[PDB]
Amino acid sequence: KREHEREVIQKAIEENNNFIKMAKEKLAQKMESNKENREAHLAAMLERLQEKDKHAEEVRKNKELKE
Amino acid sequence: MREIVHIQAGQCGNQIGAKFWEVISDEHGIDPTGSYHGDSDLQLERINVYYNEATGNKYVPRAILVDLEPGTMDSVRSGPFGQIFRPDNFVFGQSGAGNNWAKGHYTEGAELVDSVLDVVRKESESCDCLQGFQLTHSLGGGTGSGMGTLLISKIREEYPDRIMNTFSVVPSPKVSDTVVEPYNATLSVHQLVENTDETYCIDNEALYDICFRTLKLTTPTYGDLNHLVSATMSGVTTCLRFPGQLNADLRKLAVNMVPFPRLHFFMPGFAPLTSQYRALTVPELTQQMFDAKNMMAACDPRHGRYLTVAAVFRGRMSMKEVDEQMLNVQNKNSSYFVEWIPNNVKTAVCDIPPRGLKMSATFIGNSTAIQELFKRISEQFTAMFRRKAFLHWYTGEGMDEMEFTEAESNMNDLVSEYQQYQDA
Ligand SMILES: Nc1nc2c(ncn2[C@@H]2O[C@H](COP(=O)(O)OP(=O)(O)O)[C@@H](O)[C@H]2O)c(=O)[nH]1
Ligand SMILES: CCOc1ccc(-c2cn(C)nc2-c2cc(OC)c(OC)c(OC)c2)cc1
Ligand SMILES: [Ca+2]
Ligand SMILES: [Mg+2]
After folding, report:
1. For B1-259, which CATH superfamily applies?
2. Distance from Cα B138 to the centre of ligand 1, integer Å
């Protein structure tokens, strides 16, 4: 009975800790996956705006190189 | 063998315990501060059973107060007889037990249990010849139920040859704090079956019905329930506390009352029922104490058979007429006493009566009908357990469902065991 008394309280700690662990990790997974996703969105937005500039350089050369 | 050490666990435990000490201190002429202001030498002749003698001839109870929150033990200190208890013997935690067995037995209570046993040892060491222990508690809550049954196991480990009595307030929906009581009660019962020699089943169902029906109290408090308990508790302990010639100890009672070791669950009774001017004749006390209406455990004793009975008449009366009356109910209702235990009713008389009444009668019965109480709690348990309802409160403290299935089964065997001798 004494070894069972310790087996219960050790288990109580184990699962309390496990809940903190898998909460702590699941939250880290989300905040990293999010930051990757948000920057992926803003990088593609800026890459489409940087592609517009290169097109406006082809238009400004087709005026110069058609005279 | 003279000294008994008393422990009171949790709210109910400390509440009824306080009243037990109020009642018996009055019968021994011990005032609220601890000094003796009586008259008889009979009040002091077996005072050493429940009291230590202190410096300046003060009498301090041999009583340890246990709880996992400071609420109740604070009220006991503020209450009428609070200044008599040794302050070192107030052992309390702070976080509470949440009406949770697991907290009381395995986690919160585990943290405090060693500090309780130090005081137990402190009170035991200065006992000339320790005869046993008695615990007031409830099986419905957390502290008294869980921690109470833990302390019982610890006390047995350290003092395996002493007697362990309990005054155990069994729960009921009629007077309920929380839906989880049947869980707590069932886990406690399994403990008590192993680790106590006698367990007085005080059923709250019974105390309510007695307060309601047979005392005309429309809305009864816990106070009204505890009057009945502290009277009963004074009654069973009369022959230990007073003389004499036919004098008593715990072990002889335990021996003669308990034919099989697991069947030590008694069914108390008291007469007359109070909260009066006409004193009762001896034939009335005898009729009343054996009446189902006067029983503290809500079981019909006609639905089983008595293995053993013990009866304690208090007051100045004809011991001829007591014998004659006790022999009347035995010889007129012999089907309800087992034939295979001869002379299984023992009567004692005590000349000192309790406060208020000129003559009373306390009744202690080890009937097979007590199975009904365990069947009632076993039904209440399964209604919830079959859907694992409310288990999260316990599994969160490390408990397993296996432990519940065990405790269920142990109590269903107890009921089978009581049923076995009801037919034989
Ligand atoms: N007879 C009686 N029963 C009580 C009293 N207080 C609580 N109970 C019962 O005991 C159970 C609750 O246990 P409680 O002592 O409050 O919890 P604990 O303090 O954690 O042991 C329920 O079944 C209540 O009906 C009381 O003063 N008298
Ligand atoms: C079924 C017979 O039960 C008995 C017979 C005798 C005794 C007993 C023997 N001694 C020396 N003292 C007791 C005794 C009897 C009591 O009942 C009146 C007591 O009150 C509860 C008692 O208090 C501890 C002792 C016991 C049971
Ligand atoms: Ca703690
Ligand atoms: Mg409570």
Report:
1. Tubulin/FtsZ, GTPase domain (3.40.50.1440)
2. 6
Chain A residues in contact with B110 by the CB 8 A cut-off are 5, 9
Q: Is B138 annotated as a binding residue?
A: yes
Closest residue, chain B, to A19 (C-alpha): B396
User: Angle B181-195/B148-158 helices, nearest 10 degrees?
Assistant: 10
Confirm or reject: Cβ of B175 under 6 Å from ligand 1.
yes
Residue B144 in marked binding region: yes
Task: Give the total number of structural domains in chain A.
Answer: 1
Full DSSP string of B163-217: EEEEEEEE-BTTB-S-TTHHHHHHHHHHHHHHH-SEEEEEEHHHHHHHHHTTT--
Q: Options 3.30.1330.20, 1.20.120.140, 1.10.3120.10, 3.30.565.10; which CATH number does B260-369 get?
A: 3.30.1330.20
Asked if B110 is an interface residue toward chain A (Cβ–Cβ < 8 A), one would say yes
Provide the resolution (angstroms): 3.2
- By what technique were these coordinates determined? X-ray
* Angle (nearest 5°) at CA B269 between B263 and B273: 165
Window A:3-62, CB contacts with B under 8 Å: 5, 7-12, 15
